[PDB]
Amino acid sequence: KTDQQVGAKLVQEIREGKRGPLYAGYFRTWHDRASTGIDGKQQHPENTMAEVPKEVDILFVFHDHTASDSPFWSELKDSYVHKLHQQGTALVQTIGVNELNGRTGLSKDYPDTPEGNKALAAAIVKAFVTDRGVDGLDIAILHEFTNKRTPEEDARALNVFKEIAQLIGKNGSDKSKLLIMDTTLSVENNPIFKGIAEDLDYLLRQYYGSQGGEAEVDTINSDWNQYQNYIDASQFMIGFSFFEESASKGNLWFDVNEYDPNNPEKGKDIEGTRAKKYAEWQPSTGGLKAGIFSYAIDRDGVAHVPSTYKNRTSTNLQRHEVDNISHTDYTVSRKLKTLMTEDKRYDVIDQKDIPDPALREQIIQQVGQYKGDLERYNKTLVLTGDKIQNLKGLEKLSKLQKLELRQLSNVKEITPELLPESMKKDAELVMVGMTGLEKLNLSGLNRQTLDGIDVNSITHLTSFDISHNSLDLSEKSEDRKLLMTLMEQVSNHQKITVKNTAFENQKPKGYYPQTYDTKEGHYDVDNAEHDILTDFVFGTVTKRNTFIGDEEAFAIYKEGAVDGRQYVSKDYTYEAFRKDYKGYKVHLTASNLGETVTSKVTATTDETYLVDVSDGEKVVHHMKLNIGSGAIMMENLAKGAKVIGTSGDFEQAKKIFDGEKSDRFFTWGQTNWIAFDLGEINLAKEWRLFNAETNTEIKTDSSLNVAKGRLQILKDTTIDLEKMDIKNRKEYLSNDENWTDVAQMDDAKAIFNSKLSNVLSRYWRFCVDGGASSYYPQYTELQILGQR
Amino acid sequence: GPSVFLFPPKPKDTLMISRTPEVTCVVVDVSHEDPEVKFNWYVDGVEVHNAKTKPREEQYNSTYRVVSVLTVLHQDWLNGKEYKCKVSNKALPAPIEKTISKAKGQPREPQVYTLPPSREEMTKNQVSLTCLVKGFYPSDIAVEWASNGQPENNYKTTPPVLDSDGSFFLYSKLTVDKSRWQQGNVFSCSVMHEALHNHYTQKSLSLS
Amino acid sequence: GPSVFLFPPKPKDTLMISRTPEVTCVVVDVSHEDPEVKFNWYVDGVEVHNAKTKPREEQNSTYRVVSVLTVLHQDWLNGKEYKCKVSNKALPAPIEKTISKAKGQPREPQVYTLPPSREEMTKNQVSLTCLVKGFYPSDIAVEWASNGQPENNYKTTPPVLDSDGSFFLYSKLTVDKSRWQQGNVFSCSVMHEALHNHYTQKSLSLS
Ligand SMILES: *[C@@H]1O[C@H](CO[C@@H]2O[C@@H](C)[C@@H](O)[C@@H](O)[C@@H]2O)[C@@H](O[C@@H]2O[C@H](CO)[C@@H](O[C@@H]3O[C@H](CO[C@H]4O[C@H](CO)[C@@H](O)[C@H](O)[C@@H]4O[C@@H]4O[C@H](CO)[C@@H](O)[C@H](O)[C@H]4NC(C)=O)[C@@H](O)[C@H](O[C@H]4O[C@H](CO)[C@@H](O)[C@H](O)[C@@H]4O[C@@H]4O[C@H](CO)[C@@H](O)[C@H](O)[C@H]4NC(C)=O)[C@@H]3O)[C@H](O)[C@H]2NC(C)=O)[C@H](O)[C@H]1NC(C)=O
Ligand SMILES: [Ca+2]
């Protein structure tokens, strides 16, 4: 009929995926012969959009440089669209995101309000779709390096986009129009994508240049891993770029072959090109992709500028033969389209895959229409209705994450050879209303649970085999209760035999218990080694949390039986079931507040430890451990102590009492002192110095350690430094005659701990007597350890 | 091809015990194609492995930057030890080697003088507290302002200027509301330089 | 290959009627082999033919070539662009360098003279200080004088961008303490396009 009534049939058959894999191309408006610049002069006569061939399913109108009053726009509307529609090519207008977000265009003419953004959306559809005579709209949402878009801008863009989705697209008033987003942002940094994905026909991801890894597609596979949650693979399209003329560093991608001086036609060869790679590339998961697209299709066939020009720039410009403009045959585009349509994966699902026509129909509607979808589909399949006789071909859905069998009344048999390999790796299996099913064989599928099988609706059951699975059928298990129902169902039709109720040879998998009981462990002072893991943090559980402490408990578990029929596999070793507790570490804080990492403790003396057990990534258990009568937990009495004097920087001295090891104190010398005030008199039993190398911020060499020092207390037990003048206080604390040593340091240890003779003192001083080298010594923390 | 730039530590960081000085090494214009950039650091020709390489930073399309930051010991820097940064890459013919050390020459102690506002400036809502530092060498120096123990932050300092005697001088200009000046608050001009005792002096400035 | 540097006029020369301002264009590292260096001068993209090229100067086997264009005070102060274009055989393409005066609302400098610090008075030479602040653009000239005669033992800081978008600097005249204490008057002369007749003077004597 009309240019609009023909275009509606293109869009419909494109949307329903009847074209096979798609090829698309961004035509640069300023390379059409009808295009004119601001001075009303022609820019390039060599090429036109009308010559784009039928192998291009979608041609994107990509606008810049073409002046807005150019005759081009009439030619596009009145001439090109008609010509292109005759072969079955759709036109789509590409606009930038800044058209929506307020930065440019009609968005600066409408307020950022619910009603304003709606009216803008409608203005955009008219301006860029209706008036231009094209078949859809493509919004380009790219990565900004410099003037990144404000959250307020992106939020507006999305709101405007969602309003456009009401007017055009799969979910719009007008469904004769495609709605597309192209982007260069990953899902994690693409909030607009997340919001509009449900309304998109296609996402076009530009992947020009290498994308990392040996096969240069790392970023594509990683991105798809996220994209797949929001769109189907049938909506996903990856793009390469042709060589643009006079392109400098920043726009040199090498997606097509380089110039060859002996083969003018090398640019038209697609062999060993990223273009061919993208045509060939498919997602691991979800299904086959929609297709590929090219940037600057008007440059189809032109060889890339040689690698030697890789770093040419706008100023430092080294031009080349290939920077000249040329007519194109679209040779590369047609080769890439033919390649994809000749790919065997896009062959349709036939009776050789799924025999049953009723099942074939439903699988096609849910997973896709191509052979290569079956391999990849990794979501849910819901099979329904009384037309399905047999489930042959369902095994091809290797990655299926869930299978729901709902009211399949003419299905009489379920065998393990019918179900997909994903069932052996914990895919979900639901079946409800299986009124015709008489035989349920789920043997050898490593089923860890019987969840999903609505046993009450399986009313015509006569036999079942759930043997060679990974079930826990112990007394207090849900799975045993489900088995009991399966047997009661069978017993309604015939006496329960071994020939119709197989449930033996279970190899239930082992897991770490979620919580351990011991919150307060105890040992005698037996002068023996004990192991905290074997004694207190031990054991394995099933999927149903059945605890097996040791080999002996596993033996009792194996002896378990239903109707005197042992259900566990006899050939199943404890070594297999048990967890090995590999890489479990035990962190021990003593009463000393000294830390060690060991599961061993030799019970020589009275002690108490706090025990934090780590699997390797997280703490799985805390408890206390008293050796003998125990010891009372000391505290760092020096924590937050007031500095009252020092030979160095006063503010820096305060970092010895902050409780971190993220900063150090030193002076321009090998000697220094810091005097400090614990605020009250308390019983000091030990002290601890964390030396220079304990620094947790800068990797500090031990040559910066304190080699020799002295901890001291003030002589005058009851002197009021309170009431002393600042000037006198300094002279007083500086004078060595007022201080008695209480501890000595003679070793450049990373951590130095020694005991004190039950020292009662408010005021303390620590002198550094020398370093481990000529480098001025540092230390990070000082503890005075005892009871309050 | 990739270039290399080697920046010295901030003079305050070399002189102040509270701070950790860093030599920084920047590699610009790294290609997407061959992205691996290995750094080797030397201190008087002795390899050190304590450096810390930050991950690449796309500057523009398909072109990255890579920074490596080596912590330095105050003494090593001030004793004028050479810091060599060596960069390797596939898109380099040979590795690139850049070296920096401290400015050599007989140190001269800065003289710090604080100057009050001009009578003529007192007609304005904000007045200019001035600090003159003169006769110092080398030109590595740091100037800060303070008042009542809190940092004053609305100031600007001139670059060092070579005086006629071969030493350097500069001016720092703290701007304060006239109210605060007239009320008789004390302001401090802190100067940090290698030729000062503890690399530090403070001069005060209040209304007479 | 050859490099090009284009220097603006001395700010006093643009501001004073007695003086003739000049834009100067220097080409360094010219080879002995291909020595011909052609200059073209443009004022707002309009070629001017009144330039004056000085002959080569061995700065080995490498020459330097300077070309000096006289400018009209008004043209400079109205912010006209001066383009210098250099040609050479050992250049792939000609080199084009441009300078103009910084565009922006001019702002009048405030000149304050500051006497020595009490603490400096213990020394045989003391520092007379002149603060110039709040001026735009940064083109400025500072001189000292006393009893009508120029004082010449001074140094001035480069302009520094202040937090309000204007510039400031300090000039520091050094005098024997004797001359300061004897009560001589010193003058700080400031020359800038935003001053009346591009000139003011502030005095400084013992108080
Ligand atoms: C960075 O790369 C990405 C692609 O890579 C992707 O991201 C990277 C990080 C990796 O992850 C990749 O794997 C991944 O694939 C670029 O994105 C696409 O890339 C191509 C080029 O590779 C771009 O083509 C260029 O487009 C400009 C015009 O671009 C419009 O659209 C942009 C985004 O929408 C927007 O940023 C632009 O500003 C511009 O937008 C428009 O603005 C005008 C008003 O200014 C408005 O009227 C329009 O409506 C509006 N259009 C919109 C919004 O779509 C184009 O100019 C470029 O071509 C010039 O340069 C070529 C040589 O490099 C040359 O051959 C061309 O002829 C042309 O040059 C000029 O010709 C004219 C006329 O003869 C002449 O007057 C000029 O003097 C002359 N100028 C110069 C200097 O050469 C080029 O085609 C796509 O825009 C972009 N998006 C899509 C959807 O394809 C990204 O652009 C790259 N960034 C940079 C800075 O290059
Ligand atoms: Ca600390």
Side-chain angles (χ1 to χ4, degrees), chain B residues 113-114 120 130 163 171 173, chain C residues 118 129 162 170 172 202:
Chain B
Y113 306 114
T114 58
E120 295 190 308
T130 299
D163 218 311
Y171 283 92
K173 185 182 76 67
Chain C
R118 295 52 53 197
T129 295
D162 217 314
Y170 284 91
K172 184 185 76 67
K202 279 310 182 298

Side-chain angles (χ1 to χ4, degrees), chain A residues 150-212:
Chain A
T150 77
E152 290 71 10
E153 279 175 325
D154 280 356
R156 184 181 189 190
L158 177 73
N159 289 130
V160 179
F161 204 158
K162 280 163 159 288
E163 287 286 359
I164 297 170
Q166 302 297 114
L167 301 174
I168 54 174
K170 56 162 71 153
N171 298 336
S173 303
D174 191 353
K175 299 180 199 307
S176 64
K177 300 288 139 38
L178 289 172
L179 182 61
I180 296 173
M181 164 183 330
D182 80 80
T183 190
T184 58
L185 295 160
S186 297
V187 179
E188 20 272 291
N189 314 109
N190 198 327
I192 310 179
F193 171 66
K194 292 205 274 282
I196 198 64
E198 56 171 78
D199 300 307
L200 296 177
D201 288 292
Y202 301 102
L203 180 80
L204 267 68
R205 218 304 189 169
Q206 307 179 53
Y207 282 123
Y208 319 153
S210 172
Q211 306 300 303

Side-chain angles (χ1 to χ4, degrees), chain A residues 649 652 663-664 666-668 778, chain B residues 10-21 72-75 78 141-144 190-194 196-201:
Chain A
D649 176 33
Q652 206 70 14
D663 205 346
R664 70 274 175 294
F666 74 82
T667 65
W668 304 112
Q778 317 178 347
Chain B
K10 292 180 299 200
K12 183 198 176 170
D13 293 350
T14 68
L15 290 174
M16 290 290 98
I17 284 169
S18 62
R19 309 221 52 68
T20 226
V72 305
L73 299 186
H74 303 73
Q75 300 175 256
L78 285 165
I141 200 166
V143 181
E144 297 181 7
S190 309
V191 172
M192 277 157 299
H193 184 281
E194 69 174 73
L196 289 170
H197 185 262
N198 282 337
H199 312 142
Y200 189 80
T201 48

